[PDB]
Amino acid sequence: IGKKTACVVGGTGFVASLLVKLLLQKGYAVNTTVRDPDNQKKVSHLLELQELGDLKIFRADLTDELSFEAPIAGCDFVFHVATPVHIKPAIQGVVNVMKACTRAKSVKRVILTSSAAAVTINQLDGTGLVVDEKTWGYPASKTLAEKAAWKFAEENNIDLITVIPTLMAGSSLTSDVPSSIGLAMSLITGNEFLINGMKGMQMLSGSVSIAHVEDVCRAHIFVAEKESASGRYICCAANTSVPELAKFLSKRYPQYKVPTDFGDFPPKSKLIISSEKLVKEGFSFKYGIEEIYDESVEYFKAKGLLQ
Ligand SMILES: [Cl-]
C-alpha cells in the first residue's frame, strides 16, 4: 500500500527534530539517527515524539557509511541537514549518507538542507572571535557540502533536491535554544553582541532574511512529495534591515524596549532573497514576520528568557 516511509538523519537537529515530528503527523513512518543515544537529556524531545507514530531511532555516525544502511533501508525519502544550526565533517557526512542511498532501491529521492548562513551563524558560536571598534557569505551560494552533494548525486544518478534557508526562528523542540533564534531575537533580548552579529549579517550578506523552521521544514517535505520538483529551493519568508526590523518590533512590542536609533547604519539592505521558485511550484508560507516574532517571543518567554 501507499504506506509511506522516510529517513531523517541526525534527529537531534533543530530543523531535523521538527521534520520528524512533522513527518509523523503526515502519516509517514520515520527512521531517524544520532551519534550516541546515551545522552538522556539529548534525546528527551525524541522520546516524546514516539507517542505520535512509528518512529524508529537508529544510531549513526557520519563517519561509517555502514551506520546509514540500517535506518536508510526501506525509506522512500532521505532528509539530511548538511549544515546544522549548532566543514570537512559535513562534506564527508553527505557522501556517506548519499553512499548508502545508492545501496537501496527504496529511496525514491533525497532532499538536502544547506545554507551559507548556518555555516556563518555557527561561527558566531565560535570561540576566540576578534572584536574591533568597527566570514558572512552570499546567501544563494552553495556550500562545498552542497556542491559535493550535487556532484555525487549527478555521478550516481540519485535524485537530489536541496533547500536553502536563511535566518530561522519560531520555536524548537530541542531542550537548549538555538543560536539562530537568539540572533533573530537579540533585537528584543537586547544582547549587544548578537545585534552586531545581525548587523554584520546585513552588510556581509546584505540582507536580513528570515523564516520559520516549520515553514523551512514543510518546504522540505513538499518538495520531497512534489514529483515535479527539480533543483535548489531558496526558502525565506521575510526580507528586511536591522533598523527597519527594530522599528517594526518596537511598534509591536510595547512590553519590551527595542533599540530604535542607529544613525549612520543603512536603512535598506542591498539584497532581497526571493522564494518565488519555491512559491511558484506551489508552497505557501504559514508564518509571516509577525507570526515569526510572536512565536519566537512566546517561546523565549516559555523558555524563561524574558519578562
Ligand atoms: Cl538544524
From Swiss-Prot:
SUPFAM superfamilies: NAD(P)-binding Rossmann-fold domains (SSF51735). It comes from the Eukaryota. Keywords: Flavonoid biosynthesis, NADP, Oxidoreductase. InterPro entries: Epimerase_deHydtase, NAD(P)-bd_dom_sf, NAD(P)_dehydrat-like. One of its GO terms (biological process) is flavonoid biosynthetic process. Inhibited at NaCl concentrations higher than 200 mM. Produces the terminal flavan-3-ol monomers required for the formation of proanthocyanidins or condensed tannins in leaves and flowers, as well as in the skin and seeds of developing berries. Catalyzes the double reduction of anthocyanidins, producing a mixture of (2S,3S)- and (2S,3R)-flavan-3-ols. Belongs to the NAD(P)-dependent epimerase/dehydratase family. Dihydroflavonol-4-reductase subfamily. This is Anthocyanidin reductase ((2S)-flavan-3-ol-forming). The gene is ANR.
